[PDB]
Design a protein around this motif. Sequence first.
Motif, PDB file in Angstrom:
ATOM      1  N   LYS A  35     -14.898  78.418 -36.273  1.00 36.85           N
ATOM      2  CA  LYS A  35     -14.323  79.131 -37.404  1.00 36.85           C
ATOM      3  C   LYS A  35     -12.831  78.869 -37.560  1.00 36.85           C
ATOM      4  N   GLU A  36     -12.120  78.624 -36.463  1.00 41.22           N
ATOM      5  CA  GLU A  36     -10.667  78.489 -36.476  1.00 41.22           C
ATOM      6  C   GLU A  36     -10.292  77.027 -36.274  1.00 41.22           C
TER       7      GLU A  36
ATOM      8  N   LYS C   6      -1.052  84.435 -33.924  1.00 39.34           N
ATOM      9  CA  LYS C   6      -2.445  84.407 -33.503  1.00 39.34           C
ATOM     10  C   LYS C   6      -2.531  84.715 -32.016  1.00 39.34           C
ATOM     11  N   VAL C  27      -7.588  84.432 -33.479  1.00 38.69           N
ATOM     12  CA  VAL C  27      -7.666  85.273 -34.668  1.00 38.69           C
ATOM     13  C   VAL C  27      -6.250  85.622 -35.104  1.00 38.69           C
ATOM     14  N   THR C  28      -6.043  85.790 -36.406  1.00 40.29           N
ATOM     15  CA  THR C  28      -4.772  86.290 -36.907  1.00 40.29           C
ATOM     16  C   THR C  28      -4.690  87.790 -36.663  1.00 40.29           C
ATOM     17  N   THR C  30      -3.865  91.803 -36.631  1.00 38.00           N
ATOM     18  CA  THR C  30      -4.030  92.779 -37.700  1.00 38.00           C
ATOM     19  C   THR C  30      -2.745  92.919 -38.503  1.00 38.00           C
ATOM     20  N   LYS C  34      -6.222  93.052 -43.453  1.00 37.53           N
ATOM     21  CA  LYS C  34      -6.997  92.153 -42.605  1.00 37.53           C
ATOM     22  C   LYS C  34      -6.946  92.649 -41.165  1.00 37.53           C
ATOM     23  N   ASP C  38     -12.666  92.560 -37.644  1.00 36.65           N
ATOM     24  CA  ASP C  38     -13.684  92.090 -38.578  1.00 36.65           C
ATOM     25  C   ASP C  38     -13.746  90.571 -38.653  1.00 36.65           C
ATOM     26  N   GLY C  39     -12.651  89.879 -38.333  1.00 35.62           N
ATOM     27  CA  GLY C  39     -12.686  88.431 -38.283  1.00 35.62           C
ATOM     28  C   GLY C  39     -13.473  87.880 -37.114  1.00 35.62           C
ATOM     29  N   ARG C  43     -18.733  85.736 -35.386  1.00 35.99           N
ATOM     30  CA  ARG C  43     -18.625  84.451 -34.714  1.00 35.99           C
ATOM     31  C   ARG C  43     -19.937  84.109 -34.022  1.00 35.99           C
TER      32      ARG C  43
END
Lengths: 136, 62, 211, 25, 83, 132, 101
Positions: A35-36, C6, C27-28, C30, C34, C38-39, C43
């Motif tokens: 995904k990244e 990240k 992940v970026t 919070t 966003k 939830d990101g 996966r």
Amino acid sequence: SLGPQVAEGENVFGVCHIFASFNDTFVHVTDLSGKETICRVTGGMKVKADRDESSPYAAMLAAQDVAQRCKELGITALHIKLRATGGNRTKTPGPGAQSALRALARSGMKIGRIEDVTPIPSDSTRRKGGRRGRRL
Amino acid sequence: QPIKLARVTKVLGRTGSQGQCTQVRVEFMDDTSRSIIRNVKGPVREGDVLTLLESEREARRL
Amino acid sequence: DPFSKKDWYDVKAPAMFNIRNIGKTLVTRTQGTKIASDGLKGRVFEVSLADLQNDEVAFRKFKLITEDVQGKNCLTNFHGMDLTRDKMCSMVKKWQTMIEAHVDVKTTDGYLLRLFCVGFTKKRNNQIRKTSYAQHQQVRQIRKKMMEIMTREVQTNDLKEVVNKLIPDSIGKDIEKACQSIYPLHDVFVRKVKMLKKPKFELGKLMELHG
Amino acid sequence: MRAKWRKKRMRRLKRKRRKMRQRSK
Amino acid sequence: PLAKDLLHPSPEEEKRKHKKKRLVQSPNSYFMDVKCPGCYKITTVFSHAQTVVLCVGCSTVLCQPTGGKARLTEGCSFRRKQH
Amino acid sequence: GRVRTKTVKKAARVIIEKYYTRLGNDFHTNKRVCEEIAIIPSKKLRNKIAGYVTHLMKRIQRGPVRGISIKLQEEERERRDNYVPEVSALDQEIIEVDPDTKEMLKLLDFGSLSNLQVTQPTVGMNFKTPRG
Amino acid sequence: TKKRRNNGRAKKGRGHVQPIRCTNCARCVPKDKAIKKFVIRNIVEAAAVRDISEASVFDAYVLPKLYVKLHYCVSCAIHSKVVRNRSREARKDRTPPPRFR
RNA sequence: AAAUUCUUGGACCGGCGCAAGACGGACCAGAGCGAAAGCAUUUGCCAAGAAUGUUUUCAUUAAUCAAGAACGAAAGUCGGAGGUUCGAAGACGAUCAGAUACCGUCGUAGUUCCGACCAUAAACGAUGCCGACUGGCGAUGCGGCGGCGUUAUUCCCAUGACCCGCCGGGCAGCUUCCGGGAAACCAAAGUCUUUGGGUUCCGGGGGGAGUAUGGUUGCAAAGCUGAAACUUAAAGGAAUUGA
Ligand SMILES: [Mg+2]
Ligand SMILES: [Mg+2]
Ligand SMILES: [Mg+2]
Ligand SMILES: [Mg+2]
Ligand SMILES: [Mg+2]
Ligand SMILES: [Mg+2]
Ligand SMILES: [Mg+2]
Ligand SMILES: [Mg+2]
Ligand SMILES: [Mg+2]
Ligand SMILES: [Mg+2]
Ligand SMILES: [Mg+2]
Ligand SMILES: [Mg+2]
Ligand SMILES: [Mg+2]
Ligand SMILES: [Mg+2]
Ligand SMILES: [Mg+2]
Ligand SMILES: [Mg+2]
Ligand SMILES: [Zn+2]
């Protein structure tokens, strides 16, 4: 930009999706999930003429840039997903597959598993070209 | 990007569209384990040293 | 440089496997709407079984989907099973018969699965002929045997136990043993396990899957 | 001129002949 | 061979011939006495029975038809007869 | 391109058996042999004939040459060819016999020989090569 | 004159076999007439196996294969020298060339 | 080799899903079925079929067939539905002396399903159907029969999977001084000046020409039937030697 916070003694794994087409080569490192995106360097941005986008030299140059940027983020080992165009069209990996993967093994990266993810269809739609084919 | 030098192990044959370049396999004295095949222009003996500007690309056999 | 904002999250496999650590994910962080959680909720990880088991076959893969994030630790669950293309393309060879079957079945808990299975007719050590084929009616009764078996080790138990059966080739082994009386077939595997519908999520159940 | 194109030309000529005759009938 | 005798074949090569291709036609089937292990009467059954034959008295069944010779049920002894 | 033409090869292949006792090992001595024992129209052709004869002798030493019959070597074949042993290789006090030939013998008047021995025929008709 | 007994193909009691598509160009060739080639190679050439092996995180890692089957029309087979013309007597034999290397 | 083309208004690439319409790879073979055209994911239903097995039944009921009848790839035509891919026509970019082409981007009809027309293909085995006889050898598919032996059921009879054979149809293969042929080649294209088993269709030097006209079928495109004037010493088949 520093990378994962972890003590040494183990590798941290990414995955590179190599798309060795007959017109250029995609070296695209991602995390485990895919995904990244972490670094995507294509063989076509390292040459001045678009005849050499698929050249093995460009694939070697692309992989070296990907590996160097990969070291910055902290990733030490990669899993390989080799891929041709596949689908309806030709299914043999392009000339850049051999040179792109050799560079990652010589730039300090550690090779994990190698798998082929070319999209073979059960049967696809009718293929480009006439019934008489591409004659020249 | 350093520059490597290596010695030829044998002469494989004469190649090129006009028979002007030779394929030989080179053997590094820096590392006695790695050997590759390279094209060389000019008359080449066995055991001489070739100055390789870059030593990463491999020449296809004939 | 987006990668400065990240952070990294660890991924933990369910307790039913030996090795716990799959790897790490990005992940970026919070920022406003966003949420970092939830990101990471959808996966999907393709991990070979040799990575999860201490010592097993390397031609079987499992799809593990993160379900929850408990703080720097992503929690995964079984999502699907898959057989590597290298092994799959190697079992298919000329002068023999391919037999395929699939079944739709719901476990005791509300898990709906597709199970694809494959098997190939085997040549005798004594055999002189080359073809080694099977009649159509023999093929039919092998696969109806092959469907009627696979449905019984899945609908009688829950998701935990079927994956335990999936770690070895127990489902494939029983198909081999039963169908030898009709036509002896050798390379039998559960080729692919697609999962169709999940039950409504309940956090208590997940924490049992992770000890 | 292969027989395929010869008969194609003949068909076109016959179509024009038929149209011109039906013009007068 | 040229001087092969067509009048006199040995029974070895005459049995393998097709039933219609013999020097004179002769069927390959036969009749036989089938006795159940339970009862005491003996029934006459065609080798290629072509029907499900069961002993009278509704004791058991005798033979099951197939694509060729009929197969006898387990335990039923048979002996063929000549004339 | 030092390939001997048939003229040089034929004379060498004729001289060598007629004078194998005289012809030796070195090039210079048998150069003198050929000059008088056969008329050679030129020196350069004599040297090539004598040189090939020298090469031929070394081949003869290791083993017989198919083209040339040296008088000393075929007379060695006669003792190699007239050799006979003292006990016949066909005489055995016991012989391996399959049962079916014992029946083939039984149909003959040789119902039971003295030195027969019944051996079990093989089980499983595995005598055809696999198809592939 | 009739060049081949079987007319270049393997159709003997069918009357219609489904066509396929060649791999060099997209020519439509009957499946029985086409020239099949089932290549099996490594992912990496023999010149790169040591490089990959020295980088593997495992020990004694088997190298994966890559199975793909090629289909060729007659024209693309002659141009790529997978097959070539033979003498009239040599046309009849059909054992493949030696598999010694 | 490029260009037209998409592209910070985030293309290509990576993941996760969703929707639609085509298509059923690999297994797949000088293997199977079907009158030919043709036919390949699973399962269910319906009707049919060859071959084998048969000490069943009827007793000549048969073979080939003017007129006539049913099916008949693709393309095409007419009405509905749907339209992913490919793609006649068309537009553009190249190439070229030109390029209304080969190459590349887009793209209409069509390609898909349903219901009616059309009846044509190198619809080829370029080889009518029925019957008889005339050499071998090894396989393959289906049915039956027999036999040392391995393996599964398991709990042995019997069943499946192998092995060795015989019989009957089937698609084929190898070899041959059977024989034929102009030869290529064919176990049929053989049993032909030593000419006759039965029967249907069809050819008579090359063009003009499958044309004109009349008829007939079709919505149309077109299908079937089908000359003459005139012109011409050749046209053509197989094989050989050169270039
Ligand atoms: Mg076009
Ligand atoms: Mg060409
Ligand atoms: Mg020709
Ligand atoms: Mg056809
Ligand atoms: Mg399939
Ligand atoms: Mg008619
Ligand atoms: Mg049609
Ligand atoms: Mg149409
Ligand atoms: Mg329409
Ligand atoms: Mg133009
Ligand atoms: Mg075009
Ligand atoms: Mg298009
Ligand atoms: Mg016609
Ligand atoms: Mg014809
Ligand atoms: Mg006559
Ligand atoms: Mg005429
Ligand atoms: Zn092609």
